[PDB]
């Protein structure tokens, strides 16, 4: 129901929200009160607070997966033709940054960098799920597209660390948020903003897939 | 970090309280209990209260030995960033060398275990900020950060000033950055256990590729 599935959405936002800040130690009572709902909500829609918690994971993945799933049906077509076109394989990857950008400099999204940030230190079933539906799959694509583009092996340990450095780049203005507004005076970031960070991220981009083609 | 300790004593269990409150904190935030900090740390509960008088101020001197642990740690690069722009034209060769030095310090750091509960507590902050964060920005982050744009200025033959400048320079630390702040995916993707010297060597190899192929880049 419409209604069911918006007191669903309301329960992952507050629980997003207060597991992004505290983990674990978040309590049911303060989520369902955030939510605007009973606590019997959460027992009813997830179960405890720990189901609670593995449904904000599952969440994560869905939410991110369909945010990428463009992409990747755009990459399945690309790579459906006998014809090379190594400049298009190039644009994949900046599109890629570009959406990722996009998504990472959005307060809308911030508590899920909250969540996922804490998950990384230390993981948890929580992340193990995000990986193996999401994250294993877009990282390893995008290694495959670099180790493509510059004519490398994928698999190459060196591939996945060009790769994972690469991505450092377009992560680093969420994961480096405050200090990064501080430096450049910016209250908060905007359309504006964060098409700057994307033209300097591509700029790098570009710049190190030329230098690695071997 | 509060008032100055007269003993041995005093010191040593101020320190573990403060180990055991950058786990806590790191993990939990201001929801960690001062009960569980003491626990961990093999103190008293009052042992809190006389130090620190209260949970947010050991939060705080949390946020205080992190700008302490980092500012000694990035102490000599930052002497030596100085003692280089102290001269008309300086060594083109020695600013990149300071840049790559910065960089492998990062990484050897971020790649030890015990300094993870410190990446916690400013990644928490990084996205919900307070005094904490403050604090550490204006002793070691906003100086380090500055220095290294400096830098990177020096070497392209651009402005330090320009806002373009200070998003290239940030870009480019992101990617010492990444492997901590995505170490599980990192580790999950290389097959590796945890890091070690040998793997900080091949992180620092790929790192300085990147950094060269930019600078380069962009000195044109």
Partial sequence: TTKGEQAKSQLIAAALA?????????????????????????????????????????????????????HAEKAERLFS?????????????????????????????????????????????????????????????????????TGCDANDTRMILHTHALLGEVLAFRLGKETILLRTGWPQFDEEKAELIYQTVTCHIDLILHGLTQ
């Fill in 18 to 70: 207060q597991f992004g800040e505290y983990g674990l130690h978040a309590t049911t009572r303060d989520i369902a009160a955030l939510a605007g709902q009973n606590i019997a909500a959460i027992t009813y829609y997830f179960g405890s607070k720990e189901d609670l918690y593995l449904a904000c994971a599952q969440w994560i993945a869905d939410f991110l997966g369909e945010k990428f799933r463009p």
């Fill in 81 to 149: 033709q006998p014809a090379p076109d190594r400049d298009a394989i190039r644009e994949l990857i900046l599109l890629a940054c570009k959406n990722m950008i996009m998504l990472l400099t959005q307060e809308d999204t911030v508590n899920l960098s909250k969540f996922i940030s804490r998950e990384q230190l230390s993981p948890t079933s929580a992340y193990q799920l995000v990986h193996e539906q999401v994250i294993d799959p877009l990282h390893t694509h995008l290694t495959r597209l670099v180790a493509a583009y």
